[PDB]
Every structure is written in structure tokens, then in C-alpha cells.
Amino acid sequence: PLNAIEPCVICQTRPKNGCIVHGKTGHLMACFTCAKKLKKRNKPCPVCRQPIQMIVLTYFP
Amino acid sequence: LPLNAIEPCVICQTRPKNGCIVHGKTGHLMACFTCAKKLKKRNKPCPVCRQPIQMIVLTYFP
Ligand SMILES: [Cl-]
Ligand SMILES: [Cl-]
Ligand SMILES: [Zn+2]
Ligand SMILES: [Zn+2]
Ligand SMILES: [Zn+2]
Ligand SMILES: [Zn+2]
């Protein structure tokens, strides 16, 4: 996934570490800060429009 | 920026890192969904932090 290393598609600054979770699937295209704002404002997933169940701060060990 | 995100699953060394191991509010992404599901199914902890595995999230990269 060559886009995994590109910046947050919302702020184009921070890395993609704000995983938007819904059930057993996640869309990772946004930083924790950007993804938390969406959760806080009760917005859906930007790409699939499923509700945001949680934000997971994603590390690549 | 996490340049290691595009390296393969550290377990099978084949499939991409799309098996996010979730525990509390954090996730360790270093394994494919297949490999991460086997760990969860067999009730193993997170390979790198040993926290219990709450869930595996099949991670897509829009
Ligand atoms: Cl959250
Ligand atoms: Cl699971
Ligand atoms: Zn952002
Ligand atoms: Zn989504
Ligand atoms: Zn694997
Ligand atoms: Zn862990």
C-alpha cells in the first residue's frame, strides 16, 4: 500500500496514524488529530460513510 | 511518516500490513489480517507489546 507512507489526506501534514474503525474494518487515510475531530463531531467515515466506532492511534512497529 | 508501513507482514513475510492489532485506544500494525487473525483466534497477546488483543481490524488505505 504505497499511500500508507503519504501524509493525512485532510491536513496534508501529519502521518496516517488515526485509523477510523467500524466493526472489523478500518480506513486509514488521516492522522489521529484529524480523525479524532471527525469522531468528536460524530461525522461518518469520509470514504465509506459507515459510522466511526472508534479512532485507533496506529503504530507501525 | 511510517516508511516501514509498505514492508510485508513480519510473520509470513508475504502479505501487506493490513491486520491492525487493537488494544485500548492504540494499534500495532506489523502483520497481515490472516496472521493477526490466527493470533486472535488462538487468544495470543500483541506480539510487540503483549497487551491482550481486543480485536483485529482489516485496515484499508484509501
Ligand atoms: Cl475514539
Ligand atoms: Cl477480532
Ligand atoms: Zn490530519
Ligand atoms: Zn470507512
Ligand atoms: Zn502475515
Ligand atoms: Zn501491541
Residue numbers in the entry:
A (entry chain DDD): 431 to 491
B (entry chain AAA): 430 to 491
What's in the article?
Since the G443T substitution produced a stable MDM2h dimer, we wanted to understand its impact on MDM2h’s structure and function. We purified MDM2hGT on a large scale with the aim to crystallize it in complex with UbcH5B–Ub. G443T is located near the UbcH5B binding site and is in proximity to UbcH5B’s K4. However, in all MDM2hGT-UbcH5B–Ub complexes in the asymmetric units of both datasets, the G443T sidechain is not within hydrogen bond distance of UbcH5B’s K4 and in one instance UbcH5B’s K4 sidechain could not be modelled due to poor electron density. Based on these observations, the G443T substitution impacts neither the RING domain fold nor UbcH5B–Ub binding.
The importance of the ubiquitin ligase murine double mutant 2 (MDM2) as a key negative regulator of the tumour suppressor protein p53 has been studied extensively.
